[PDB]
Design a protein around this ligand. Sequence first.
Ligand SMILES: N[C@@H](Cc1ccccc1)C(=O)O
Ligand SMILES: N[C@@H](Cc1ccccc1)C(=O)O
Ligand SMILES: [Zn+2]
Ligand SMILES: [Zn+2]
Ligand SMILES: [Zn+2]
Ligand SMILES: [Zn+2]
Ligand SMILES: [Zn+2]
Lengths: 296, 296
Amino acid sequence: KTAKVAVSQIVEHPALDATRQGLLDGLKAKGYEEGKNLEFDYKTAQGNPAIAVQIARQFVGENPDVLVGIATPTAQALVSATKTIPIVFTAVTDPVGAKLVKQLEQPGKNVTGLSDLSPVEQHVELIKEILPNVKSIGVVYNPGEANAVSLMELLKLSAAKHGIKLVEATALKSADVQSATQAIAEKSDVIYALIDNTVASAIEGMIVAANQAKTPVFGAATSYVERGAIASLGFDYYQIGVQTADYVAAILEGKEPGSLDVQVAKGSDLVINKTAAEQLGITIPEAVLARATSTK
Amino acid sequence: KTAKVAVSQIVEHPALDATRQGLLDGLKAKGYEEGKNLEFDYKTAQGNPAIAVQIARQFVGENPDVLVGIATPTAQALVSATKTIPIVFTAVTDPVGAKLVKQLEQPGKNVTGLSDLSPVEQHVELIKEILPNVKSIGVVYNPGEANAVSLMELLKLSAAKHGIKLVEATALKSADVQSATQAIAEKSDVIYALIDNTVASAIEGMIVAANQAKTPVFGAATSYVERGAIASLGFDYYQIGVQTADYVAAILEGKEPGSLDVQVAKGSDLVINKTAAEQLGITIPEAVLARATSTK
Ligand SMILES: N[C@@H](Cc1ccccc1)C(=O)O
Ligand SMILES: N[C@@H](Cc1ccccc1)C(=O)O
Ligand SMILES: [Zn+2]
Ligand SMILES: [Zn+2]
Ligand SMILES: [Zn+2]
Ligand SMILES: [Zn+2]
Ligand SMILES: [Zn+2]
């Protein structure tokens, strides 16, 4: 009679924390309240792929009604640890590429949820609009994250389509992100800070290195503009969490997760960091400043 | 390796919520953190003695490392539901009278914790100091709460010692507290709002009735002065929660709960509500206003 929802999250960074808060508030609006009829357990893997596996195993052994995997690596560990307990993943960039589901329509097993697939093409076109003389896009990513790998395939096709050279470096853990940024910032006209958990957890260090090379950072997430990216075009992760509660409630009420289609997030907010831009000697064009849903 | 602490609370009122927050923060300072190595589950009985029993049974069936009973009725249900899982009670007025322990020194079974036994004698002497012409003390209490019963025995001895008549009414649930207050407020020079969960959860209604009879309320808890009691001499429930974490951590580290002495809270803060007092046409004496650790 108490619903038991167990939430595993690869690391605490603001986007994933907003997703988790959104889930909690959305469950409340559906009549599931902590303290009354909802036990909401939560573990962070602290960026460790190993802890992600241990969390999945511990949670599976406590027989929750629904498992929630926030971000790709923790979702992946859940899919490995159970084939029968419903899994709702959330804020996962490319669930097919991550092997969480065979396809988005009618996934058909114990797994379903929500994708935050970035519109990479739109981000490149936006970088070109803000910075019309871009020849070069720098990017740091973690090849251990299937989300980053899927995004790099989209970025490589879109860079080539627009005649833009990609300058790449990998970072295997968040403490290498600043060095990786430093290695590439002077060969790049702009750094694309993508939807990668390792980047997200070290975004301050990325920005310190970029600022030192006087290279702007364009963010795929709003949390990045908050820390000094000049602009971003990201989703609202709190609302994605709120929509995640729809899946969890439907499952708790007896729906099979495999019968629920995977939803892809839509509508990103254009945000501009005027201060950061001016410190870099950058003038954000008028047509862009006019569309800015927000403007710090 | 994850500590599992399950917390049962009779009802959400501010004192018990502060105790619970204190417990959580104290566990953090001891190295037990939610999301990492601490699963902290929480249920409120919503004032229902029956739900208290159901919570105890559900929690016992989930094999937590330590059960925490905040307030007497939920502690009592835990003691009934398990004889072997460690129970740490907290904010319990009189654990011997409540049958949680045989005695405070070396309780010797699966139960230990912290008492918030009110210094009733000191409260009467304080009521007489603030209001030197008191002949009559009104009190509303719930005879289903062993804490209230223990406190009434102390109040009856102290009223008689000081030549003060007690005017009493019972309230079986919080929705009767306002009517009970109304029934007695005109025969009372002051209402003593005691350490009772039913009173605490209906303190606004008590104060509405008292204010209507132009009768002051003296509070045994600071949360009561916040809502319009003229004065209070209560414990700091956040710190009691912090000290509760000492017991929980010691148990988690292999101490037997029965080998831990029950601690009695000490040091109450004198707080005065000047606004409320003046609306009642009351002048709080100088010697008292001088000792007031706080003064809204
Ligand atoms: N979409 C990412 C999570 C993420 C969200 C927001 C910013 C950065 C990372 C994943 O698939 O794991
Ligand atoms: N001491 C009370 C709890 C309580 C604390 C503070 C105010 C009112 C009630 C009990 O034994 O249940
Ligand atoms: Zn550069
Ligand atoms: Zn469909
Ligand atoms: Zn739990
Ligand atoms: Zn009166
Ligand atoms: Zn002793």
